[PDB]
Design a protein around this ligand. Structure first.
Ligand SMILES: [Mn+2]
Ligand SMILES: [Mn+2]
Ligand SMILES: [Mn+2]
Ligand SMILES: [Mn+2]
Lengths: 369, 366
């Protein structure tokens, strides 16, 4: 406990997504808050984030305020002054229960002077690292942290266009300034924000392009929770893609239940514990095939799908109780294949049928062939 | 070291953002507001107190907001824990210096407060009726009861006082151990008796009244024998106009309070640009021959006074420090009696790169 660095790890909070929305318009704020709230409740030493912190490129004053609020309420702790408030600005003393500062560390995403990072960072609440100035020639300088005997090297690469990144690695334009003080005695963390898999080989970052000396790799960008990770035995590291904290579209990857994680680093071994996020709105997606189901057909399709949406709703309620009075309006998406001569309907029309019952007021279904 | 003294840096109207987009003066507001806080730190005070008009603009820019927070973190935030050693609580730790302020005239200000760098107070729920709940502070045996009234249109405040609709909630425990400090942001003087706040309307139990909203530095303060308190109108930290009050050299003060006793130390601002102003009556001058083709003469006399004002300005910048920036120079010229004048901007352009307000160098009147 005295030589173990505790890092709460998450990614992609997307602060300010759907601000205007009359149902979901707060989700962003709430969950980014749950993230930092867990960190204090679980008493970690720092927070690491995978980038994509604000959604909008120029965030609202509301968004900026909300991130700041949650950052203070949880990560600032106690402020020292010889001035007591009788009726904080709160006297610290040197008590056993003293509220320490939990510094937040993040790289930048594709969303990420001045500048969203500038206001967070200048208040000393968020620390930005791994930023890249030239894409053609990158020089990654690490953060060096010491807790007890354990030493942690923290390397960062801010989001680079994947193709450009692909070539920079291939042409040797990505150097890692490693330290020579206690060389080979550091735990090396890499925090990136690129696609992990791609349709096109040059549009992602191959795990093989990441040098064997690294022990841990935090994977931003990708929103799907894969918090348990994977061990690359050729590069000898462990890759954790935490996923986002909010469902930023109705894709199958956003349906996997969101978590964050505490990375307990001691010396050179580590332990990672997954922690379910409660504040995230449930998202159940079902794929329906016309051929599988058993032409002048309206009633047969409509009743089935409407009773199939009411199926997902109760399945989504189940998982909010499992994740955790009334649960929040769930997100429901149906992918249906109406091949084989089946009578369809209007997409939004079907989605006006569930107003007040689902949170995605517009696209509850998509009809493909 | 003792310590039973509450030390408070007093200042007002920093007007962060004023003249943001000017090539020359663009950065004055930011630096002078930073100096205020830099001094507070150099002098190890316990807290900062401002009279309001912190931001010049209603919605200050993302730049204006950035600088204020930068200055607040650098000088006021102080050291943070963090139990983790970055390799790139001792006895030389830097403590937090809390900033308290009232309002002048999801705000940027709410950002200042939510970060935990400034505490807005003295808010008024209703303009017609004002109730003032005091912040109670204490450091040792010394007890400070800090009261605020954020700006109210002088006409309504006047009346709200006269009609006994302004109530002060005084704490009942240790009744007289409280040193009572009031922060206001109103006109101190006016030509009609309802558009300023008379010191007489302020209840006699106060001991020190901080007076924002009057930009002119009168930091030496004033004793009110009848009400028995001391009024200190520190002034702004930038010249927000070219008026006579803006000419008095800008200052801030550290206010040491022990028990019901106080003492005010005053500090000259270094970062404030010089501003000299000359009031000129052409009939009060020879060599300017009245009622004949005098334009050539008037011009040399005026151009010389400007030059003369520039030297006084440079000199005043050195007196303050203990190369100067381009000075602010205003000539208020009374041309009555048959004297020929020039275009004000033509005249002001004869000093581009020489003064900091080229567009305005003079004002002609009768
Ligand atoms: Mn991304
Ligand atoms: Mn993202
Ligand atoms: Mn003002
Ligand atoms: Mn004012």
């Amino acid at each position: 406990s005295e030589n173990t660095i505790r890092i709460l790890i998450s990614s992609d909070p997307h602060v300010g997504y759907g601000e205007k929305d009359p149902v979901r318009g707060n989700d962003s704020f709430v969950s980014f808050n749950e993230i930092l709230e867990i960190a204090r409740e679980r008493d970690v030493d720092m927070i690491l984030l995978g980038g994509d912190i604000f959604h909008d490129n120029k965030p609202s004053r509301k968004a900026l305020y909300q991130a700041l609020r949650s950052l203070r309420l949880n990560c600032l702790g106690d402020k020292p002054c010889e001035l007591e408030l009788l009726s904080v600005c709160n006297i610290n003393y040197l008590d056993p229960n003293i509220n320490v500062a939990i510094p937040v560390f993040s790289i930048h995403g594709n969303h990420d002077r001045y500048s969203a990072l500038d206001i967070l960072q200048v208040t000393g609440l968020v620390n930005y690292f791994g930023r890249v100035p030239e894409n053609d020639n990158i020089v990654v300088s690490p953060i060096l942290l010491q807790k007890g005997f354990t030493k942690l090297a923290l390397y960062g690469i801010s989001n680079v266009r994947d193709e450009r990144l692909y070539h920079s690695f291939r042409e040797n334009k990505v150097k890692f300034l490693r330290p020579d003080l206690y060389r080979d005695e550091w735990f090396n963390l890499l925090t990136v924000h690129q696609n992990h898999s791609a349709h096109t080989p040059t549009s992602y970052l191959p795990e093989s392009f990441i040098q064997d000396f690294y022990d841990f790799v935090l994977w931003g960008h990708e929103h799907e929770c894969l918090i348990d990770g994977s061990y690359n035995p050729t590069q000898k590291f462990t890759v954790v893609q935490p996923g986002s904290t909010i469902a930023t579209s109705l894709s199958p990857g956003e349906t996997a239940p969101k978590h964050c994680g505490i990375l307990n680093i001691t010396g050179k071994d580590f332990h990672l514990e997954k922690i379910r996020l409660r504040t995230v709105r449930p998202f159940i997606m079902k794929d329906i095939i016309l051929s599988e189901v058993s032409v002048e057909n309206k009633k047969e399709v409509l009743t089935y799908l409407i009773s199939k949406v009411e199926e997902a709703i109760t399945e989504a309620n189940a998982q909010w109780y499992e994740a955790q009075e009334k649960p929040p309006l769930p997100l429901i998406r149906l992918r249906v294949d109406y091949t084989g001569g089946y009578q369809t309907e209007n997409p939004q029309r079907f989605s006006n049928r569930f107003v007040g019952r689902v949170a995605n007021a517009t696209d509850v279904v998509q009809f493909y062939l």
